[PDB]
DNA sequence: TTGACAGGATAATTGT
DNA sequence: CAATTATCCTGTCAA
């Protein structure tokens, strides 16, 4: 909180990454985000944001 | 509505980049101009696009 | 030539 | 991990 715009691009480097990998831990998170600037807990959520819609 | 605005805009150089005002900081910008707190978020999110958007 | 509400999308909260 | 509560962003027209 608040909503925190991520939100330039940034993004859909993930949308295939989700298609690649619905899992990751810490070790990637540097180049994964430190070259991108944003914090840890900003996106530990973001798979969990997208384990729905649907995902029946 | 008149001059319930340039107050809003004259400071806006402060959070031009980051319209992520604090939830109670809406108040010190609200009541000083006031009116329904719901109407005030709306005015600051119906102007991101009026300009600056074409200014790119 | 600018300001109100419903709609459909989204990011945090949070504790059995 | 599912369920929540807080968000703006657009997308429907109006004095």
Swiss-Prot record, chain A:
It is found in: Nucleus; Cytoplasm. Residues 1-56 bind DNA. Transmembrane segments: none annotated. Residues 1-51 are annotated as: Interaction with DNA. Coiled coil: none annotated. Heterodimer with MEIS1. Interacts with IPO7; the interaction facilitates nuclear translocation of DLX3 in dental papilla cells. Transcriptional activator. Activates transcription of GNRHR, via binding to the downstream activin regulatory element (DARE) in the gene promoter. Belongs to the distal-less homeobox family. It is linked to Trichodentoosseous syndrome: An autosomal dominant disease characterized by curly kinky hair at birth, enamel hypoplasia, taurodontism, thickening of cortical bones and variable expression of craniofacial morphology. This is Homeobox protein DLX-3. It comes from Homo sapiens. The chain holds residues 131 to 186 of 287 of the full protein.
Swiss-Prot record, chain B:
It is linked to Restless legs syndrome 7: A neurologic sleep/wake disorder characterized by uncomfortable and unpleasant sensations in the legs that appear at rest, usually at night, inducing an irresistible desire to move the legs. The disorder results in nocturnal insomnia and chronic sleep deprivation. The majority of patients also have periodic limb movements in sleep, which are characterized by involuntary, highly stereotypical, regularly occurring limb movements that occur during sleep. Acts as a transcriptional regulator of PAX6. Acts as a transcriptional activator of PF4 in complex with PBX1 or PBX2. Required for hematopoiesis, megakaryocyte lineage development and vascular patterning. May function as a cofactor for HOXA7 and HOXA9 in the induction of myeloid leukemias. The chain holds residues 280 to 335 of 390 of the full protein. Residues 1-55 bind DNA. Residues 20-50 are annotated as: Interaction with DNA. Interacts with the N-terminal region of PBX1 to form a heterodimer which binds DNA including a cAMP-responsive sequence in CYP17. Also forms heterodimers with PBX2. Forms heterotrimers with PBX1 or PBX2 and a number of HOX proteins including HOXA9, HOXD4 and HOXD9 where it acts as a non-DNA-binding partner. Also forms heterotrimers with PBX1 and HOX proteins including HOXD9 and HOXD10 where PBX1 is the non-DNA-binding partner. Heterodimer with DLX3. Heterodimer with HOXB13. Belongs to the TALE/MEIS homeobox family. This is Homeobox protein Meis1. It comes from Homo sapiens (Human). Expressed at low level in normal immunohepatopoietic tissues, including the fetal liver. Expressed in a subset of myeloid leukemia cell lines, with the highest expression seen in those with a megakaryocytic-erythroid phenotype. Also expressed at high levels in the cerebellum.
